[PDB]
Write a protein that binds this ligand. Structure first.
Ligand SMILES: *Cc1cc2c(cc1C)nc1c(=O)[nH]c(=O)nc-1n2C[C@H](O)[C@H](O)[C@H](O)COP(=O)(O)OP(=O)(O)OC[C@H]1O[C@@H](n2cnc3c(N)ncnc32)[C@H](O)[C@@H]1O
Ligand SMILES: [Cl-]
Length: 418
């Protein structure tokens, strides 16, 4: 019963030093565990790919999986209060049943809400903010066990959602909602990079509510284009690529059964925004991930820099996805303060082969002020990375106020706060 266990992230490339995952079964127990522990980090659903959740030797790794997962919709207010450990699939089910909806979702819905917003998680669409952008309040258990609630409008709130877990344990969050809406997903194949000029790139990325491009970086250009269209908005002809003949997966050869419905068949928002259907429930994945988030005005130059090194990228690549994100108010969001283009890479799970490719990719993106996704694999040096965040000092002051001893600062966060 008392024997050591091995605790990893979802993809299993990160093995934590913790020999047990503590899952307190009450908020009283959680407060006491936090107060009594010298160093703490929280594990959500483990869909990070780096050391962000590692608390160091002797540090406590705790989870909310032992507490009830509550999803409380106020229909008149159009809000939902959720536990930090609740995952997006359940959140979406419950809000949809109340006739309400989120403005966006990530690719796969089986990810914790608190952990998603902690790192900058986003979907696509030129007018759609990050997942954090709909949070209007957070509730934290701080280092001494006490609760601090921070709401939108509080001078601190810009640092309180996407915080890398550095302020305390987020026990609940409240999100804003909109009326439930219908969508259609239309997939296309073969979009050239040649002739993808500023006007055409803008037209393509704005052609639906959320648009992704996918490529293998093998033949020139893009292999797929996914349009996720609201039925309450117009859909113009899309002459730029061929209509897909078959149901598609982002990664060529992987099972398209896993993916949300295509061929433009209408269905609800939460069955169209993700790329992966709720029924698809993988307990791990044999992959790594990286993503770089740049000013949207650099999209073409960045795509052209990556095209020039395509032969270096391709051998370790499962798929690359290009997305857009609206400017974020959160100080540590990779989309902070600027409309954004994102370049995501799902790699083969071969750390030794991937890291040198990541380093070369990062070099290629330096001219475009690329910020890495905090949840994913990156090798940007700490000082260089700190220089990319205008309000980093403000964040550090907030962390110092709420957590003076740095109970929630691990090695990952320490390099951000240095
Ligand atoms: C696995 C995965 C991830 C993923 C994705 C697809 C898959 C298969 N698609 C994404 C996408 O479309 N867009 C996007 O921007 N990200 C996508 N991701 C990445 C993923 O969403 C993030 O890496 C996310 O942060 C993972 O959250 P999760 O909860 O699974 O991961 P974690 O390692 O356990 O924790 C991450 C950080 O959050 C802190 N955390 C977690 N819970 C809390 C609470 N309650 N309070 C304070 N912090 C918390 C962790 O400590 C860690 O720092
Ligand atoms: Cl091309």
């Amino acid at each position: 019963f008392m024997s050591d266990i091995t605790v990893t992230n979802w993809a299993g490339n990160i093995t934590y030093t913790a020999k047990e995952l503590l899952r307190p079964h009450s908020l009283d127990a959680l407060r006491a565990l936090v107060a009594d522990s010298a160093r703490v980090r929280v594990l959500g659903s483990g869909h990070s790919f780096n050391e962000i959740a590692e608390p160091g030797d002797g540090g406590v790794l705790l989870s909310l999986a032992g507490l009830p997962s509550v999803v409380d919709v106020d229909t008149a207010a159009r809000t939902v209060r959720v536990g930090g450990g609740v995952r997006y699939a359940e959140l979406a089910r419950v809000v949809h049943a109340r006739g309400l909806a989120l403005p966006n979702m990530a690719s796969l819905p089986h990810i914790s809400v608190a952990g998603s917003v902690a790192t900058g998680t986003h979907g696509s669409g030129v007018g759609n903010g990050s997942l954090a952008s709909v949070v209007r309040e957070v509730e934290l258990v701080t280092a001494d066990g006490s609760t601090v609630v921070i709401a939108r409008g509080d001078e601190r709130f810009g640092g309180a959602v996407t915080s890398l877990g550095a302020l305390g344990v987020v026990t609940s969050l409240t999100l804003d909602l909109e009326p439930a809406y219908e969508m259609e997903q239309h997939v296309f194949t073969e979009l050239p990079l040649a002739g993808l000029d500023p006007a055409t790139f803008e037209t393509v990325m704005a052609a639906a509510y959320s648009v992704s491009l996918f490529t293998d970086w093998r033949a020139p250009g893009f292999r797929q284009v996914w349009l996720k269209r609201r039925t309450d908005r117009p859909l113009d002809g899309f002459p730029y690529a061929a209509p897909a003949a078959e149901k598609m997966h982002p990664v060529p050869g992987m099972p398209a059964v896993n993916c949300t419905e295509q061929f433009g068949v209408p269905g609800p928002w939460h069955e169209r925004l993700p790329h992966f259907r709720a029924e698809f429930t993988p307990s791990s994945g044999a992959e790594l991930q990286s993503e770089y988030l740049m000013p949207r005005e650099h999209a073409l130059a960045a795509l052209h820099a990556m095209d020039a090194i395509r032969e270096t990228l391709a051998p370790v690549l499962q798929t690359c996805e290009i997305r857009t994100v609206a400017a974020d108010a959160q100080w540590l969001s990779p989309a902070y303060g600027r409309d954004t283009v994102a370049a995501h890479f799902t790699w083969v799970e071969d750390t030794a082969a991937v890291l040198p490719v990541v380093r070369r990719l990062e070099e290629a993106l330096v001219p475009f002020a690329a910020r890495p996704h905090w949840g994913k694999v990156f090798t940007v040096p700490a000082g260089e990375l700190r220089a990319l965040y205008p309000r980093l000092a403000d964040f550090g002051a907030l962390a110092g106020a709420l957590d003076p001893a740095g109970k929630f600062t691990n090695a990952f966060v320490r390099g951000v706060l240095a």
